Symmetry: D2
Subunit: 268 residues, 4 copies
Amino acid sequence: TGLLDGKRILVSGIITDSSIAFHIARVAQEQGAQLVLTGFDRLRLIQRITDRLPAKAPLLELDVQNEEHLASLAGRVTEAIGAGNKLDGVVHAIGFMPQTGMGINPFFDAPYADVSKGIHISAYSYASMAKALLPIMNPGGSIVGMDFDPSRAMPAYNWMTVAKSALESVNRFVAREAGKYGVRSNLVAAGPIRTLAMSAIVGGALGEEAGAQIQLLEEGWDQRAPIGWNMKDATPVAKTVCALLSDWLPATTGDIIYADGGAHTQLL
Amino acid sequence: TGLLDGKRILVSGIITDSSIAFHIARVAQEQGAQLVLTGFDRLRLIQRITDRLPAKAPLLELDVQNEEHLASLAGRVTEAIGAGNKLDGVVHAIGFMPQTGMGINPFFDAPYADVSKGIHISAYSYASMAKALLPIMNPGGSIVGMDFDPSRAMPAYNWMTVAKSALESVNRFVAREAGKYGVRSNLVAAGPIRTLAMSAIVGGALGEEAGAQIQLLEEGWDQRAPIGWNMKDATPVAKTVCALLSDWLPATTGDIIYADGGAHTQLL
Amino acid sequence: TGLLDGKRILVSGIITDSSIAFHIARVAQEQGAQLVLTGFDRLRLIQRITDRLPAKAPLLELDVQNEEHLASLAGRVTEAIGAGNKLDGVVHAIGFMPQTGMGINPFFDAPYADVSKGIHISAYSYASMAKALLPIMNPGGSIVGMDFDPSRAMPAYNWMTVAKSALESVNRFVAREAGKYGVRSNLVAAGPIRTLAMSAIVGGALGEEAGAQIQLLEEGWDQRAPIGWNMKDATPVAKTVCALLSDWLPATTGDIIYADGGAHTQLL
Amino acid sequence: TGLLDGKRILVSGIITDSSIAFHIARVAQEQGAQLVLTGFDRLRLIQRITDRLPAKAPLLELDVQNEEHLASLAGRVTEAIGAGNKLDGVVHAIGFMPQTGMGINPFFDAPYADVSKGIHISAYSYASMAKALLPIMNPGGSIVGMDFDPSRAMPAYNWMTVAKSALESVNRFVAREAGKYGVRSNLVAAGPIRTLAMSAIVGGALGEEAGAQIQLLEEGWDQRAPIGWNMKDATPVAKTVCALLSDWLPATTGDIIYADGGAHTQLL
Ligand SMILES: NC(=O)C1=CN([C@@H]2O[C@H](COP(=O)(O)OP(=O)(O)OC[C@H]3O[C@@H](n4cnc5c(N)ncnc54)[C@H](O)[C@@H]3O)[C@@H](O)[C@H]2O)C=CC1
Ligand SMILES: NC(=O)C1=CN([C@@H]2O[C@H](COP(=O)(O)OP(=O)(O)OC[C@H]3O[C@@H](n4cnc5c(N)ncnc54)[C@H](O)[C@@H]3O)[C@@H](O)[C@H]2O)C=CC1
Ligand SMILES: NC(=O)C1=CN([C@@H]2O[C@H](COP(=O)(O)OP(=O)(O)OC[C@H]3O[C@@H](n4cnc5c(N)ncnc54)[C@H](O)[C@@H]3O)[C@@H](O)[C@H]2O)C=CC1
Ligand SMILES: NC(=O)C1=CN([C@@H]2O[C@H](COP(=O)(O)OP(=O)(O)OC[C@H]3O[C@@H](n4cnc5c(N)ncnc54)[C@H](O)[C@@H]3O)[C@@H](O)[C@H]2O)C=CC1
């Protein structure tokens, strides 16, 4: 019962319970949504994490680079939600960039093969997912992906920033396609969230200066966010995704909502 | 009962029942909000329009250019909502630009006195209102103003576009001040809505070519909006304002939400 | 002889020899331009400063708030450059915001009268100047104003940022008018330059925290500028204005060139 | 002799004499630059076209997807310009997107392999080129790539728009690397230019509706460009690239210059 009551919503992107997609799933369920989850490699792992969601959700394997996964995905989803039932909501919370595309590995040293894979998973998959899923979405539906504002360059994020810029562009095109279905497509630009991966990088897994830069990045974010930014709390982000999954932003599409504390609106 | 349940919200900007602020008020009430309304010149008129709101709301006179109105405004509001009661929400839906700052009057011919008055009412008043009202707002509160995307120049809107650019800038500063109160400040960038004024301009009240350009503007908007744009329906806008007035965009401030059909994300 | 050879160019905005407009004038003359200068209040003062320009330039009084100054300005300019001679170039380097609109004076405490005056001089005057001068500009001509990127809020700059946002908007409209003359209109967004006024603010003239914030602002600018930023050197800015005054950016109008070290393209 | 006098400048991207890079090369030579050209597949063809350049230029093979081409590229260039001679300028004018990523082929139907190749050539190659060439560039140097404003989605350009968004992002990162060399990196966002490829698409080579949309795109561009836009003339673009290759935009990097008639600053 609540914001998303009665809505059926596929949430990709759970890998640990500190995944942003975990909290989107959690908040969505608290808000009445019925979910279908997708999970990339470690399905036993993800099933076990998602057990802690306030409700059961069928989990489906989706490797966004796997053409057959995508080819089969809408059938598997209507299996999970039942025939004559369509999705109202799709959450893309998938992202990856090989280590060479990030951190201390010099920007120019990331091999295109690595960059392409990251763009595949992080950008192009937003379109793949919309292609697989728009056929099984209701008018009034809503696709949401997870963005990290790439409008300016920053240390360490390197090719993942480039991947996010591609994503923003994809999302504008997905909006165009989604529009034919009465469906909105939008990104949520989140502030830095202390995801397991993020904590690794902060603690030096991608090099000390990268880890140092990201820590400075985090602190500056909260400093300039007029409402502050708490990187340890994904809930404001999860709620924002739910905001877009709902009927309360019905004239917004091709767009980016900044759940970033307002940090992007402030220079210092 | 609903999105705004229990929230106390001042809504400025009702002048006719096709005022965008009428529908924000309507939707807000449908959603559980308790309102205080403010009304500019024709208070008998506005009282009579707002009678059609699904609930009663105290109406208070506010001329945003009247220092005493603003000086007295928070007292009058706690009178209306009761002592020890604070606002959760503030809607700025005020805008005006003298005729010389718009339409067929050449851009260079608008006298500064006229432009200044328009900027006063349309931009600076967003700050005035936040100054008067932040003292009587709860943490978690939300100020919302009404924007018309001025990031590119357009025919006929002339100095009102300039006034909107000023407003976007003001809002970023208001966010900074509002943040000290745990309060968000944001604009909703709406698509063209057929307000009484808009219909006048379309029908030539500001000159035929202006009226012609705005009609083209309207049609192009709906053409490029991937979800379409219905200028006769302010509801998607009103809902978007409610989205921001709620707890569902809690990490967004200093910001602009585009309730414009997605038209701004598309070139053609 | 050089970039601006043969071009006749009005340069407003000289008040001291550390005025950005001093260096634009200097570089423009080094580059072959013939100048007409305008000067606001202290004409004896400005004449004496401009004596150090590599060439003579007629100086003309222009108070951008003085309707008669503007009304008479094009006659005075053709007097200065000779009948049947038209301007190729116009440099708006004028800006002012009362102290209440800046620094430590709380944002909400700037009286509209003060803000309006600042917007008058800093934003609306860009249009006034184009109105006075477009009648006496050649096809292929170029108007340039001085911008400080107001796309995000910052400490201390307060209402001057708002004034800059208005200016960016004005410039897009001026481009539209200027286009009818074969004339481009553009802003140069400069990095912080240690102008006499700036040095005052840094040293606390507008309050210690403002002065502190602006110093941090300056340092962060140079830190994130991939090519660095030297606030003590206005030459890169002056050259950029000359770039726009020339024939080398002939397809650019309504636009903003960032002579800011690239600082705006970088987050950290 | 002129703007680029004495500058040594590698210009990629000539394939026909209506290549934008042909005209950049032409204008650069008219302006005193000494060039080294690179050419992708049809080297006999390109040699024969470039014979019409006002001066000789060594032509070097560069397939931007060929790691060995890039690995060897700086040696070949110092061979061509002579030992102890460094580049002042680099022009990236390379772009390609497989047909499936464009026009009438539905956006969702472009296979990632196709999109990746386009992003490789159109975006990632900007970084490859800067990596190969920054070692042989002088302080004060300038890399320039060719952009088509992808900030909003448009018909037919599909994945090439996405590729341009990636490019804008790459360029911000290249600026960071280039900065260590005293080198600027910037894009020129050009208006639609009637290149041979463009004419094909207009005449239906990628589908009739795509061809129709691009024609509408072209016409709207010139309509909203306050100075007009002539798609048949690449010279304003070529001059703009030269503007960036010169010393006249010395404080600009990570940036985008819009040689688009001012069309992007205008809504209608
Ligand atoms: N952590 C942060 O500070 C921010 C993250 N984001 C975005 O949020 C989204 C979710 O990531 P986080 O929660 O941070 O990280 P996470 O590591 O918890 O989730 C990333 C997800 O991507 C999935 N994934 C990777 N490759 C996949 C593939 N081949 N097919 C299907 N799924 C695949 C992983 O299984 C994982 O669940 C990502 O798009 C990320 O870029 C946006 C802003 C900030
Ligand atoms: N109509 C449209 O297409 C769009 C309008 N907007 C904005 O929506 C807001 C509301 O306007 P609309 O509903 O369109 O028009 P409206 O005419 O219905 O409302 C404008 C309101 O401004 C109030 N106002 C004018 N001067 C005032 C003053 N001195 N003090 C206090 N209030 C004053 C009027 O009383 C009126 O209620 C305005 O900010 C407008 O610029 C934004 C996007 C599009
Ligand atoms: N100093 C900086 O860090 C930056 C300054 N700018 C802009 O550069 C432009 C020139 O200012 P600066 O060289 O910094 O300061 P400045 O103090 O040297 O020049 C400002 C000029 O405005 C003129 N002015 C003020 N009121 C006027 C009026 N009523 N009529 C005619 N002229 C009037 C003054 O006489 C003065 O010459 C201004 O637009 C400023 O906002 C832009 C970016 C950065
Ligand atoms: N034609 C237009 O309306 C606009 C084009 N641009 C950009 O201008 C740049 C130059 O293209 P145009 O002159 O229009 O087209 P063009 O077809 O004349 O030049 C494109 C160049 O890319 C080169 N290229 C393709 N694959 C390559 C590879 N593997 N390695 C090395 N070079 C390769 C081709 O040989 C060709 O010279 C491109 O980046 C394009 O996207 C930007 C805005 C508008």
